[PDB]
Structure formats: C-alpha cells, structure tokens
C-alpha cells in the first residue's frame, strides 16, 4: 500500500531547572525506528527497529549531529518566541515540529510535510505545494518572512522530493519482513448485562498492524455513530494495536446488532455478532 516516514521533535523549557529538554523520534508507518533524548546519559540517536541497525557508524554520527543541532536551534527559538508573544521568562513553553513524506505503492511522492506548533497551537506549516507557508498568527508571519527571505521552502522541497522518498524506499526494502506485512485483527464480541432491561455489546479488535482500522456497530443495518462508545486505538507494546467499540442495547435485541471491521490486513470487511 502507501507508506509514510515522519520525524517528530519536541522541546520543552523548564526555567530554573536547566536547559530545555529535547526529544525526537522517527517513524516509518506506525513503526518507531530511531530516537534521541537530550537528557540521556550520553545522548546519541539510537536504533529502535532491527532493520535500521545495519546502517553504518557514519549514519549514526550524522544523525546525532543533526539532532544536537536541532536541539540548539530549538533552544534559540524558544527564547525568540517569548519575544514574539510578549511572554515572561518564568513559564514552561513547548515547541513541536514534524516533517516527512508519504509515498504511494509505486514509491512516488504523494505529499510532503513540515509543520510546527508553539504551546500546542499551530504556528507555521509548509503548504502542500512545498513552496509557500501558512502562518497561524502575526508572530508566525515574522518567521514566514524570515524563511521566505532565506529560501527555506526550496531546500525542504528538495529534501522531501529526494532524500526523504529515497530513504523511505530503502527502509521499506530493508524492513520488508515487518514494514510490508499487515497483521489483521483478531476479533470477538462480548456481552455484559447492565440491568434487567439493557446490556453492553463490545466489539474487540486485537493484535493488528498498522494502526488504521474501522469498527462500527449497526442496528438493523443502520450505523449507530452517536450511540457507539469508541476508545482510541492503543498500542499493545509489541508492535500491534488494539481497539474496541461498545453499544448499549435493549435486552432481547442483541441479534439486531452487527459489528463491522475494516482493516488493510483483511481481504474482506468482517461482520460479527454476539454468539451466546
């Protein structure tokens, strides 16, 4: 199918408690493969997937250098943003950045991304054309003017259309055992009486990869979107994901409800019912 590569970065200041903490992680699809934490004993970028371990020492050296450089620029940016927003130096503030690329089945670029947030709010984002910016407020418009004068988008476009895609393709091949394997969900329906007049039906999906999935309850064939309780998809800790969806049904009407599961690992979407 299609695939993605993303690098995530967070810097958090902590006045009176040293310099900002910086954490960055890299993902291919829903698989973590590298990490760097400025508070680690001897901070280096470290592998987190078996298929990246074969990269040589100069790969690791370069990556580590980049991570440390980004940590330093983020420290400078946190000080700048205090000025842009007329903020005190007393508080903790957060800078987040994500960038990366999506490719289709043939490996061609579908689109690239580079976007930032300050204190949890959109700040500036590269537009899909990879040539212009969307700034969220007048503070971000100052960064926009700076990055336009510096021709930042031209450099990012080159990376996103080139290296990003090329290296994603390399990782997909080196990790094809796992990155190109979809694990379908193991599914079942449980039944829990609430009272003499009502019962909970819960539809489970376990052990699936990648994380994208659709679980829906139907009553007499109609989607129960507003009466379905749907938890966030959650990691099992072993590469796979879990999810459930629950409805409250009048006692005796359980057979009018069906749970529908769509996942890229399934050849056909599944229909399940409670089996007493």
């Amino acid at each position: 199918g299609s695939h993605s590569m993303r690098y995530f970065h967070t810097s958090v200041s902590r006045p009176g408690r040293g310099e900002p903490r910086f954490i960055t992680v890299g993902y291919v699809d829903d698989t973590l493969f590298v990490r760097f934490d400025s508070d680690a004993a001897s901070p280096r970028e470290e592998p987190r997937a078996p298929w990246i371990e074969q990269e040589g020492p100069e790969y690791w050296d370069r990556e580590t250098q980049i991570c440390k450089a980004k940590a330093q620029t983020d420290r400078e940016d946190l000080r700048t943003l205090l000025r842009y927003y007329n903020q005190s130096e007393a508080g903790s503030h957060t800078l987040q950045n994500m960038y990366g690329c999506d490719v289709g089945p043939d490996g061609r670029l579908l689109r690239g991304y580079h976007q930032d947030a300050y204190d949890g709010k959109d700040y500036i984002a590269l537009n899909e054309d990879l040539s212009s910016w969307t700034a969220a407020d007048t503070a971000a418009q100052i960064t926009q003017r700076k990055w336009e004068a510096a021709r930042v988008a031209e450099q990012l476009r080159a990376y996103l259309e080139g290296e990003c895609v090329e290296w994603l393709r390399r990782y997909l091949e080196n990790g094809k055992e796992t990155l190109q394997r979809a694990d379908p969900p193991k599914t079942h329906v449980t039944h829990h009486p609430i009272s003499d007049h009502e019962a909970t039906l819960r539809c489970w999906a376990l052990g699936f990869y990648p994380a994208e999935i659709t679980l829906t309850w139907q009553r007499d064939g109609e989607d129960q979107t507003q009466d379905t309780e749907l938890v966030e998809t959650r990691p099992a800790g072993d590469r796979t994901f879990q999810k459930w969806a629950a409805v409250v049904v009048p006692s005796g009407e359980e057979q009018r409800y069906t749970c529908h599961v769509q996942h890229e690992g399934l050849p056909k979407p599944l229909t399940l019912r409670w089996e007493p």
Partner: protein, 100 residues
C-alpha cells in the same frame, strides 16, 4: 494557555490468564502540556520497575505515552494506573478491568 486533559486506558498486552506472565499498560493520550506523572499500582501500592515510551504526539499536536510493566495477573491482585496532570485537581485512578 490551552490545556488538554489526558485520556487514560489501562489494559494488558495479551488476554489476561491468571498465572500467565503478561504486560500491564497505561496509555495516556490527548494531553497538553507534556509534563505528566503516571504510576502503575498493585493493590494500591506503586510498582517499582515501570518503563515508558519516548514522548511523541498526534496530528493535533497532543501528546501520548505508554507506561508498561511485566506482571502475572492473579485472581486476588488488583491493578490500576494513577495519573497526575496540570489539568487535574487531584490524581485520577483508573482501575484495570480485564474486559476493557
């Protein structure tokens, strides 16, 4: 400043079977800012050796973390996750229910 309170799920990696080793997870998501305190509890007492994932975030910029520990469920032992965050006037305790 905007603040978003954590969603909390407590669950096991594998279907729970008494006497079978497993992992107990506490997944906290959807929160901002990123400072958060998470404890796993066994019969109300903090479990000592708990690992967690590296801080990452969702498309809407809110953070998520997985805290986990090896454990062997039994009939009598009760497990829970205790979470504190700037958005909470007191820590929230979510009990482990092997049907959720």
């Amino acid at each position: 400043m905007i603040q978003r309170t954590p969603k909390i799920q407590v669950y096991s990696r594998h279907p729970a079977e008494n006497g079978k080793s497993n992992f107990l997870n506490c997944y906290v998501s959807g929160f901002h800012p990123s400072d958060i305190e998470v404890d796993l509890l066994k019969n109300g007492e903090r479990i000592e050796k708990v690992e967690h994932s590296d801080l990452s975030f969702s498309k809407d910029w809110s953070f998520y973390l997985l805290y986990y520990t090896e454990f062997t469920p039994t009939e009598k032992d009760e497990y829970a996750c205790r979470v504190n965050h700037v958005t909470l006037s007191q820590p929230k305790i979510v009990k482990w229910d092997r049907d959720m």
